[PDB]
Amino acid sequence: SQQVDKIKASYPLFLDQDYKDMLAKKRDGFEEKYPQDKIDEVFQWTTTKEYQELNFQREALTVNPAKACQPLGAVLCALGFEKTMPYVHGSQGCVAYFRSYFNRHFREPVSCVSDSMTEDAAVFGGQQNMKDGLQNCKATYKPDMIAVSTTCMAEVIGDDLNAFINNSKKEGFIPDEFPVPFAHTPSFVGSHVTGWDNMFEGIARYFTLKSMDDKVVGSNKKINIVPGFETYLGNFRVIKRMLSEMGVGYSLLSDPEEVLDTPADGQFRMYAGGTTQEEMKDAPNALNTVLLQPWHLEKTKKFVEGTWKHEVPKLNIPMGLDWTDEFLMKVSEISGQPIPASLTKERGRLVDMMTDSHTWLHGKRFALWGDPDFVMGLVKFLLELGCEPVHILCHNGNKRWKKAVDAILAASPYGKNATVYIGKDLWHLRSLVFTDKPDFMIGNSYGKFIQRDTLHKGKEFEVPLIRIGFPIFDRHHLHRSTTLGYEGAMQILTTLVNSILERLDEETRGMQATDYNHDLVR
Amino acid sequence: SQQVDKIKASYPLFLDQDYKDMLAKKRDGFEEKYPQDKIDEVFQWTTTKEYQELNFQREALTVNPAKACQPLGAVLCALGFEKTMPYVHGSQGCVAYFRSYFNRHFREPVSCVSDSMTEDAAVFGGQQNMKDGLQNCKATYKPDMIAVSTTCMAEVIGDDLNAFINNSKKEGFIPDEFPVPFAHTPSFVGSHVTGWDNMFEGIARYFTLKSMDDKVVGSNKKINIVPGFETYLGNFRVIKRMLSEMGVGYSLLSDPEEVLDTPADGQFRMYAGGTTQEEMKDAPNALNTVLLQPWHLEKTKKFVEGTWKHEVPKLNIPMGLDWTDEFLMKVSEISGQPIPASLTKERGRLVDMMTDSHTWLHGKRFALWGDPDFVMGLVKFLLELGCEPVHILCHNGNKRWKKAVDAILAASPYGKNATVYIGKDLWHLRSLVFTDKPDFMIGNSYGKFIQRDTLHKGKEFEVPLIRIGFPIFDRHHLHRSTTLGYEGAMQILTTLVNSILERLDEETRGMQATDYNHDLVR
Amino acid sequence: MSREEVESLIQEVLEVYPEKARKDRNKHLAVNDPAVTQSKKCIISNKKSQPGLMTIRGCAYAGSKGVVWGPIKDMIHISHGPVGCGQYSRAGRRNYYIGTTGVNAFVTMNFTSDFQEKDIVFGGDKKLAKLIDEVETLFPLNKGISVQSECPIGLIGDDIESVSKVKGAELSKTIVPVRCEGFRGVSQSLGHHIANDAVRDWVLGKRDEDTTFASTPYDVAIIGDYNIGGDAWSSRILLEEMGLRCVAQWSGDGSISEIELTPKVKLNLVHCYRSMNYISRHMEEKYGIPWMEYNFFGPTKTIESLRAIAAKFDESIQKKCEEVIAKYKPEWEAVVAKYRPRLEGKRVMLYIGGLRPRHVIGAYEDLGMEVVGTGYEFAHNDDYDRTMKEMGDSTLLYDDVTGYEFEEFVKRIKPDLIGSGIKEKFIFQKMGIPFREMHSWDYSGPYHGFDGFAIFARDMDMTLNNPCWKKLQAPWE
Amino acid sequence: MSREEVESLIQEVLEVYPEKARKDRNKHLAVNDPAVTQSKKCIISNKKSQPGLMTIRGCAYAGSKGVVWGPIKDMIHISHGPVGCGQYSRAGRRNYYIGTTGVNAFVTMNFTSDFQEKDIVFGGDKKLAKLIDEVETLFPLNKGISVQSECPIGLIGDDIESVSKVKGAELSKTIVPVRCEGFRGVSQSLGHHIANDAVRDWVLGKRDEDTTFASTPYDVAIIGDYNIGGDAWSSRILLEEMGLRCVAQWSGDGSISEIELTPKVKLNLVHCYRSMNYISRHMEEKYGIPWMEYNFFGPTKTIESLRAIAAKFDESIQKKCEEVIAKYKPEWEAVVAKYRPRLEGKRVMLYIGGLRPRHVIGAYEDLGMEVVGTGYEFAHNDDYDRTMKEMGDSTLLYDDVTGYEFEEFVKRIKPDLIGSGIKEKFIFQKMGIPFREMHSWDYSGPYHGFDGFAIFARDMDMTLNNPCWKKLQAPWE
Ligand code: ICS
Ligand code: ICS
Ligand SMILES: [Fe+3]
Ligand SMILES: [Fe+3]
């Protein structure tokens, strides 16, 4: 039943007695459910060290991974170029999924097309799909450029993207002058960040490989910036703002911030902003190229150093205090621009917040996961705050990255209880946070189920989730946040300390039991 | 006892069995405590409608007020002027309190002096205190200006500030040309916002009243901005940014943002930033004066219109979509500057965020309190979101303000269940949120005790607190936030929708009980 | 109205296409005529999508893993292949269930083989066998395993059927191989068909020799309700109030024992014909169980459905049905009285997968609203046969609509409200048109039944009449 | 260090003042010599503050309402006057208690008469009487009412004594008038004295005729512990482990019945001499109860204090004391072993109120730390008499230090750590010097007793050795 003046949705509607009784009848009569005592015993067992030992012996089963497939990264990279349509050569279901994933993270339209290969293409390849799809896409959505990636169907059958696109051009399906960069993005290799790297290298090669003769390093007095797979609009914005404050000429290559933040003013803008083709063509003339997320920009680095002849600086991701300092100093050295007083003051304000919050941050134990560069930047900042990373997980990390993170940890006393895991998933992490309980988790929305499980063990075992990373599906507008630079460090510090204080307030709220510590002033 | 590897502070240390047993022994043996059944019965009674009737019959007793005394506002206003020392003529305990209050809100050093009047000044007056204090303050802290307010001691004995300061100047304690504006700030009248108004009017009069002969309205092509009592640094910053984007020349009068946000770089800067004396002297030459918080800037309005002859626009506080629009349009009309495309895009982005979270915001019921302008701006924005203000409390509001808020409420269907209370305190509001339960509270840190009480009744009766306003003592760095303009509206929208979703996640976390609704995607 | 105006709009929209694409898309757009009950002569459907045109369709794996098999709560469903497919589909569909996740229920988890290059080159059957052993060790209370094939599985010649047979015999566990590779078919629809075939072959008949279940003349099964937001529960309560015993519930909040018990019921109640007609027809042929379509969207449809269902049983059930109708009449009457004045006259366009674009129309008309356009991603021509008689004269029909087409149609028709999926939502919100998600109910619901109708009406009012939609034009523009 | 250098520093700091202020402030700064016993001959204290110099002192209302009376949990304390004083002091001091706030405890609430202009002009006695009736109606479980006068009460001709007498006789309730107007005295200390007088006159002797309370030879009261962060509880546990029965603790977690029961104890244990010496001496004169000062800051002081207190009783208590010391020895030894190497050699300056500037030095010395400077807001000359023998040679002493003075002294001495209140914290954090709040324990604690010592050591290490302090200099400048 419903009351017209207070209508209930599924929660709490299904807690009504009639629904409870009906569900109990269903369970008793027809589900053949394991007895509740057995369920409790098995759950308790899944929280144990013995279960963790079994869990970490997994070799073939992956449970709740913390990564996606390459073409998602390729699509995100393609979205950063002006009037560019991401085009995925392969099956249409992949594109439906990529679009929905990005829709739910960004709460904005995401444009992407497929050439809808089917079993017929499994037998005879997808050349015809490419020709017709390029013609249809150009005719209908009128892009300045089509950036082609691949699904695993196309990769397994070995579709030659270069030959297909060239044949499409010669046979008149699309003009010969129309830019169609491409990249092979096999989903059984690496992850979404690798797909971003492959797509970016493809675009850069397409625009610069054959015209290097008249290129002179440093002649345009700019620094190229390659952000990599980035899902915080604040990060693009803060890099642009910081470079503008220094008076440093720059070229952000793959800038999707406008197309992912269009205003709601009565019209649908399929394209907005983005790196121009002229910027990509002129990039080799820059002073140097800076890679913001080097640990998944390796192929791009090889191309930029080998072909553009740029001496790409060895820089970490500009996260935290020290790495933001180092990034700014390297940019100053490359451009000859001094670091202005505004950035010095902003740095001092971050240091002031650190001194104001250190007493609550000190010694807090964290489990965290995400992409390699983001994870290592977060680890470095946590060590700067006097926090203890304990479980560091990166499902798509590698041995060299793990060694670099271990060297970061060894440089600080706060890293002594930390362990870095690569190739492990969120079920592994669930076991870890049960058997070596941290104070909090920092990760994406998939950590909410771990918080649910730890709460099920008991309130004293619950590990609250702090949502930083990608994807974030169960909170609104957090994609507007910043994690890079001093501003990002400030936002992260605020989030962390206020999560700590919010948990403390929750634990001390009980009247005459724990509220002796429910202080007004913290 | 303690364990050296896991040391416990008061919570949870005092939950150890030995401490619990000792406290039980203390209570049973020597406290003569009312039996627990009596305590439960009285609490339950305090949650009732009959208790609310008794509570609202109060005429002489105030419990948990939601306002402070005038000189606190006067000190905040004085802090906004360059190299200015707030000087409170009266007793030193008041200054100790003002400084600690602002310290805890801003986590920043707050400079203020008193002339330490004692029992002797109760019969001889405080003239000698004023002379020696002005001389000592000027000699020691080297201010460019001393802004004098008063505590209630000085007001009750009727100390003539004008005569005292003039005699200090004639007798050589301070130079005759040294600026010493003053204002009577009686704490038994109005509240802290009134003190801000009085101090600002005193400073403006001191700098402009006697030099009006050569003043020509509009000759400097600027608009004066008076922010009033403002404790969010983001608000000053956003007003400056918005006026700079429009290319509008402006003069922010009383700007304390620099002195309340100095960097931690190894030195203590007692003064920083602030409105200059030259800006205050030249203010009458502006095109017009805009008051950002008109409902406590009445005396300032009288002086600005009567003496400067500025036609002060009738504008609400620039909070929420419509009032930000109206502020920008009035500024455009006054300055002849068009509204630029950046502000149009920012407005469209706020509308985008509204259209996305509307489904979670719609119909949510709120109790809120704070200062009049802030409260009415929040009410207007909540009505714009499709939310229902239910209990609107302003302890320092008046009948005219209440009528204006009632007219705002009547203009929207979402205002149908709203009631505006003036002169009521947080004990009244506690009764209200018990007997007509809203979904959330929006207010300052003093609402945490109401959340504690509602939780004590039961989890189903708990009303979570959303901390917006002043003071915020139990979270860190929220004074950096913004509430004005499109940016402030965006921040508030994000805070509200994510508070809603966080509560929903909490309510649906129970495994096999309510987690059928623990959705990954919201 | 103006059938000629709508046909002209179809032509003007089509002009931008290249010749082959335009000729194809012309067959998938039609102007409705309710007298026309042979939709094939009017509109065409269940064909391949035109490359490069931004279709909304998913893939077989979505139709099988995402739709049919995934909701089965006490089984573990393996996404066999590279990592993407299971990750994008993890918990994206709100097929609600009661269980202890990770212990005896596994719906919102993502089990995958996470194919690497070596698995592509050397095959993945041995990895699959080891994975199944690991599943058994780590999730002992699971009651069966399904293997949902992604594209490379079909491409590399892996034999998951033999692995499933061998391992199932070895561990005495039901292991269901599903060849739902995403390149098969043209949409989620063949995914439905493949999944239904897997149910028939490996699960449905396990108790053909078992006669220990006690049966009654009032045994029914709910087929093709996936319990989005609790829809199936809100329908089951009405069925049980009418005196029926719901033995099985496919597949939302479904368990493998319920599927195995389905052949023992007296009547199959099919909500989604599109996805479960295959198994319903199979059950009629093999076990003699009759089936019937029903509709619990809005009071008129649910009253008609309850009466029709009760008519299939004796007089006592019919009396109980009239009692249920009388008991709920004031609730939906109060809902209508409150919300119809706020929605009377408003016009809606829809675009959803295979059932709802026609099933929700009665609910919209119960609030005095008109559906001026509707269409499907993957419906078949029998679906349009059912759709035409329920839509008004000279209304627009679109099959497998492209993003450009739907945007232009909306720009011309200018409906008051659009109901579609997540990939269209923000597009039309930016155009200033209210939008309700009609797949996930915008994280709201349930909408089925009398209790669902109140939520539906409140949701449509709160979105359609929201103040945000009046603020898209800046006052200085 | 280097006495002549320190007096040089005193002179150089003093040069900026005008001649009257300089001559005054010269008497309040001395270089310490532990041989000196009469502190009057070197440093002067308990004098009026210099106007305009930014003192740290509070007022008498803070000393009475904020310090002595406010912690009494089961009474309602009325801030009588305008709104400011009660609001700024509401829950600002962490005097912990067990109770149901708003029902039977009222510490963190702000009851006030909220004076308006009419109350200033026409007096407030009638408003006070009505307020008391309102309190009785709305908080029936309160066990007494105190009236804490703010500045206007003394200034205008209000007579709260007669109102309190009349109303208390009318309602059979204890109503305690306190004339703690902020203009009285020069600091919080006269507030202490006024509050103690109010306790003596209106509460302490209510049970002089009652002899129903059962007493033992081991009855003690804790006087002048306000239970900051639970300090008094952490001390009470040690006392009761020694075999003593703590009848009352003043005033943290204190109740009015405990105050009334205090005249029945055998020994008064005074923690804060400065604030409660008045009542302790009164109790010795009128009831014959001896009193002694004790110190539970750090293991050395705690052990010495426990042994002296036990020496005041029989042999059984002394044996129990040795058992307590033996039981706790490994815990504080482990704390010392872990944290002394991280703090050994570090130098600290302090500036606090009336007791803690000298009382905490033993704990710092237990962590191998040196106090190179200390001072008081409102101490008296007896306090400095104790401090000098507590402090080392050539250390700086400052009474009622100005903000400028303390900043200059710190800039010269350059200690590794500063302990003071909230108004100095952020100044010295900006100066790049680690700072611990020594009033509120930086929202940490307790620090008293063996359990408190571990928290103290952890806090000092975490702040002193925090990495933030190494980052104040940007690498490019
Ligand atoms: S199964 Fe089908 S697309 Fe019949 S694949 Fe799809 S939960 Fe739709 S119109 Mo999402 S044929 Fe169900 C459907 Fe309808 S996922 Fe749901 S809403 S009634
Ligand atoms: S009462 Fe006094 S200023 Fe003895 S007014 Fe002050 S809780 Fe201090 S040095 Mo705050 S004479 Fe207590 C004190 Fe010491 S408030 Fe506390 S820390 S031991
Ligand atoms: Fe959006
Ligand atoms: Fe600060």
Q: Which 3 state secondary structure label does DSSP give B328?
A: helix
Catalytic residues of C: 59, 62, 93, 192
User: Quick check: B512 and A34 in contact, CB under 8 A?
Assistant: no
Strand pairing category for C396-399 and C29-31: antiparallel
Residues 6+ apart with CB under 8 A from C146: C69, C72, C75, C76, C77, C78, C175, C176, C177, C178, C198
- CB neighbourhood size of C285 (10 A): 8
State the Cα–Cα distance between residues A468 and B251, nearest whole angstrom: 39
Let me know how long chain B is.
Answer: 522
With touching defined as 3+ CB pairs under 8 A, do chains C and D touch? no
Separation in Å, CA B257 to CA B70, B234, D361: 21, 9, 39
Q: Which tokens in the block code for residue C364?
A: 């919209």
A192 found inside a domain: yes
Nearest-by-CA chain C residue for A260: C426
The answer to whether residue C333 is domain-embedded is: no
Interface test with chain C among B322, B331, B343, B359, by most C beta carbons within 10 Å = B359
Closest partner residue to B512 (CB to CB) among C98, C443, C467 is C98
Rounded Cα distance, D258 and B31, in Å: 6
Which of A251, A285, A319 corresponds to the end of one domain? A319
The structure was resolved experimentally with: cryo-EM
Residue-wise DSSP of A43-98: HHHHTSHHHHHHHTT-SS-EES-S---HHHHHHHHHHTBTTEEEEEES-HHHHHHH
Residues D266 and D149 in one domain: no
The token duo for C473 is 């034009």
Phi-psi region of A116 (alpha: psi -120 to 50; beta: other; left: phi over 0): left
Does residue D120 contact residue B158 with C-beta atoms inside 8 Å?
no
> What is the DSSP pairing of strand D76-80 with strand D29-31?
unpaired
Q: H-helix or E-strand containing C163?
A: helix C160-171
Is the separation of the CB atoms in C421 and C437 below 8 Å? yes
Find the helix packing angle between B233-245 and B485-507, rounded to 10°.
Answer: 130
> Are D269 and D224 in the same domain?
yes
Verify that B358 and B424 share a domain, yes or no. Answer: no
Which atom of ligand 2 is found nearest the CA of D376? 9
**CA distance between the termini of chain A:** 46
Beta carbons of A153 and C335 less than 8 Å apart? no
Judgement on whether residues C232 and C188 belong to the same structural domain of the protein: no
Torsion of CA A406, A411, A416, A417, to 10 degrees: -50
D40 and D51 within one domain = yes
Q: Report the distance separating Cα B377 and Cα B387, nearest Å.
A: 14
Q: Give CA B476 to chain center in angstroms.
A: 16
Domain that holds residue A226: 215-319
In sequence order, what are the residues at sequence separation of 6 or more whose Cβ sits closer than 8 angstroms to the Cβ of residue D127? B60, D113, D119
Rounded to whole angstroms, how far apart are CA atoms B462 and B449? 11
Record the tokens describing residue A16, joined without a space: 């009504």
Q: How many CA atoms lie within 13 A of D87 on its CB side?
A: 28
Cis peptide before B179 (omega within 30 of 0): no
Residues A371 and A354 in one domain: no
At A390, list the tokens: 């304990």
Half-sphere exposure of C414 (CA within 13 A, CB side): 4
Name the nearest CA neighbour of C434 among B89, B358, D273: B358
What is the token pair recorded at A139? 């005719």
Angle between helices D449-464 and D299-311 (to 10 degrees): 160
Residues D85 and D35 in one domain: no
d(CA B30, CA B52): 33
- Cβ atoms of D67 and D178 closer than 8 Å: no
> In terms of residue numbers, what domain contains D305?
203-317
Phi, then psi, of A194 in degrees rounded to 5: -60, -40
Token output for B353: 């965020």
Helices D125-138, D160-171: inter-axial angle, 10-degree rounding: 30
- Give the domain-ending residue among A160, A182, A214: A214
DSSP A115: -
Among the bound ligands, name the one nearest to the CA of residue D380.
2
Q: How many structural domains compose chain C?
A: 3
Ligand number nearest to the C-alpha of B259: 4
- For C344-414, where are the alpha helices, taking DSSP H only? 356-359, 361-366, 381-388, 403-413
Contact C429 B347 (CB under 8 A): no
C-alpha distances (whole Å) from A414 to each of A362, A380, A402, C31 are 9, 10, 17, 70
| Beta carbons of B426 and D109 less than 8 angstroms apart | no
Residue A294, in any domain of the structure: yes
Kindly state whether residue D336 falls inside one of the protein's structural domains.
no
Q: Are both C95 and C175 inside the same structural domain? A: yes
- Asked if B386 and C467 come within 8 Å (Cβ–Cβ), the reply is yes
- Give the residue among B93, A487, A26 at the shortest CA–CA distance from D423: B93
Let me know: does D256 contact D72? Beta carbons within 8 Å: yes
C246 is in an annotated binding site: no
Which amino acid type is present at position D306? L
Q: Examine the domain organization and report whether D50 and D143 are in the same domain.
A: no
SS (H, E, C) chain D: CCHHHHHHHHHHHHCCCCHHHHHHHHCCEEECCCCCCCHHHCCCCCCCCCCCCCCCCCCHHHHHHHHHHCCCCCCEEEEECCCHHHHHCCCCCCECCCCCECCCECCCCCEECCCCHHHHHHCCHHHHHHHHHHHHHHCCCCCCEEEEECHHHHHCCCCHHHHHHHHHHHHCCCEEEECCCCCCCCCHHHHHHHHHHHHHHHCCCCCCCCCCCCCCCCEEEEEEECCECCHHHHHHHHHHHCCCEEEEEEECCCCHHHHHHHHHCCEEEECCHHHHHHHHHHHHHHHCCCEEECCCECHHHHHHHHHHHHHCCCHHHHHHHHHHHHHHHHHHHHHHHHHHHHHCCCEEEECECCCHHHHCHHHHHHCCCEEEEEEECCCCHHHHHHHHHHCCCCCEEEECCCHHHHHHHHHHHCCCEEEECHHHHHHHHHCCCCEEECCCHHHCCCCEHHHHHHHHHHHHHHHHCCHHHHCCCCCCC
The token pair at C3 is 């059938």
Residue D62 annotated as catalytic:
yes
Contacts of A383 in chain D (CB under 8 A): 467
Report DSSP state, residue C133.
Answer: H
| Shared-domain flag, residues D385 and D428 | yes
Residue type, A23: L
Determine which one of D184, D192, D271, D436 is catalytic.
Answer: D192
For Cα atoms B72, B74, B77, give the angle at the middle one, nearest 5 degrees. 110
The C-alpha angle D436, D440, D441, rounded to 5 degrees, equals 45
Structural domain includes residue A61: no
Nearest in space to C85 (alpha carbons), one of C14, C178, C159, C161: C178
Specify whether B90 is located in the same domain as B210: yes
- Confirm whether A205 is domain-assigned: yes
Q: Are B71 and D394 spatial neighbours (Cβ–Cβ below 8 Å)?
A: no
In angstroms, the CA D187 to CA A437 distance is: 49
Q: Would D24 be classed as within a structural domain?
A: yes
B112 Cβ under 8 Å from any chain D Cβ: yes
B511 touches chain C (CB under 8 A): yes
Distant-in-sequence contacts of A39-48, Cβ < 8 A, 24+ apart: A39/C100, A39/C103, A39/C104, A39/C141, A42/C103, A42/C104, A42/C140, A42/C141, A43/A456, A43/A457, A43/C100, A43/C102, A43/C103, A44/A457, A46/A431, A46/A434, A46/C102, A46/C103, A47/A434, A47/A435, A47/A457, A48/A434, A48/A435
CA gap B195, B88 in Å, rounded: 12
Helix (H, G, I), strand (E, B) or coil at C224: strand
Identify whether D75 is part of a domain. Answer: yes
Per the structure block, which two tokens stand in for D39? 């502190």
Write the DSSP symbol of residue A213: G
Closest CA of chain A from B77, distance in Å: 23
C347 in helix, strand or coil? strand
D353 in contact with ligand 2, CB cutoff 6 A = yes
Q: Which residue has the tokens 């403390």?
A: A504
DSSP structure class, residue A516: G
What's the rounded Cα separation, in Å, for the pair C106 and C75? 7
The angle formed by the CA atoms of residues A318, A480 and B345, to the nearest 5 degrees, is 120
What is the identity of the amino acid at B522?
R
Residue at C334 is within a domain = no
Amino acid at D382: D
**Cα–Cα dist D130/B120, whole Å:** 33
Sheet holding D291-293, edge to edge: D245-251, D219-225, D267-270, D291-293
Q: Determine the Cα–Cα distance for residues D4 and D393; give it in Å rounded to an integer.
A: 12
Beta-ladder partners of D297? D448
Question: Cβ(A327)–Cβ(A486) under 8 Å?
Answer: no
Clarify whether residues D115 and D169 are in a common domain: yes
Q: Do the Cβ atoms of B118 and B152 come closer than 8 Å?
A: no
Which residue in the block uniquely carries the two structure tokens 């450009």?
C404
The span from the CA of A518 to the CA of A508, in Å, is: 5
How deeply is D200 buried, as exposed, middle or buried, from its count of CB atoms within 10 A (0-12, 13-18, 19+)?
middle
Same domain for D72 and D189, yes or no, is yes
CA–chain centroid gap for A133, Å, is 29
Which residue is closest in CA terms to ligand 2's atom 1? D275
- For chain A, how many structural domains are there in total? 4
> What is the D353 CA–ligand 2 centroid distance (Å)?
5
Nearest to C423 among A27, A100, A188 (CB): A100
C440 within some domain: yes
Residues B206 and B85 grouped into a single domain: yes
Residue with the two structure tokens 């249409």:
A92
Nearest CA-CA partner of A153 in A77, A58, A88, A221: A88
C90, C108 contact by CB (below 8 A):
yes
Both C148 and C274 in a single domain?
Answer: no
Tell whether B193 and B73 lie within a shared domain: yes
How far from the centroid of its chain's Cα atoms is residue A511's Cα?
42
Which residues in chain A are closer than 8 Å to C90, comparing Cβ atoms? Answer: 64, 446
CA distance C326 to C306: 12
Is D474 close to B67, i.e. CB distance below 8 A? Answer: no
Q: What angle do CA A234, A237, A240 make, to 5 degrees?
A: 150
The span from the CA of C264 to the CA of D267, in Å, is 86
Q: C148: part of which helix (H) or strand (E)?
A: strand C145-149
Number of Cβ atoms within 10 Å of the Cβ of C162: 11
3-state secondary structure of B468: coil
Atom number, ligand 2, closest to the C-alpha of residue D68: 1
Q: Are residues C215 and C170 in the same domain?
A: no
Reading phi first (left if > 0) and then psi (alpha if -120 to 50, else beta), residue B180 is in: beta
Whether residue A169 sits in one domain with residue A124: yes
Helix (H, G, I), strand (E, B) or coil at C212: coil
Q: In whole angstroms, what separates CA C190 from the centre of its chain?
A: 13
How far apart CA C50 and CA C30 sit, in angstroms, is 18
Neighbours of chain B (3+ CB pairs under 8 A): A, C, D
Q: Are residues B196 and B82 in the same domain?
A: yes
Residue that terminates a domain, selected from B153, B183, B214: B214
Best residue among D56, D59, D64, D226 to mutate for probing ligand 2, ranked by most atoms within 8 Å of CB: D226
**For chain A, what is the total number of helices (H) and then of strands (E)?**
21, 12
Our CA angle for C5, C10, C16, nearest 5°, is 135
B283 shares its domain with B270: yes
Torsion of CA C426, C432, C433, C436, to 10 degrees: 40
Are residues B351 and B334 part of one domain?
yes
Judged by DSSP in three states, C100 sits in coil
Token pair for D237:
């546990």
Residues of B (373-432) whose Cβ lies below 8 Å from D: 430
Cβ atoms B145, B85 nearer than 8 A: yes
> Are residues A265 and B351, on separate chains, in Cβ contact within 8 Å?
yes
Q: Is D42 annotated as a binding residue?
A: no
- CB C301 less than 6 A from any atom of ligand 1: no
Amino acid found at A157: I
Q: Judge whether D311 lies within some domain.
A: yes
Residue with tokens 């007791």: D355
Q: Provide the 10 A C-beta neighbour count for residue A256.
A: 25
Cα C128 to Cα C177: distance, rounded to the nearest angstrom:
11
For residue C357, which atom of ligand 1 is closest to its CA?
9
Strand partners, C79: C112, C148
> Are both A427 and A495 inside the same structural domain?
no
Phi, psi at D105, each rounded to 5°: -135, 150
Number of H helices and number of E strands within chain C?
A: 20, 14
Cis peptide before C446 (omega within 30 of 0): yes
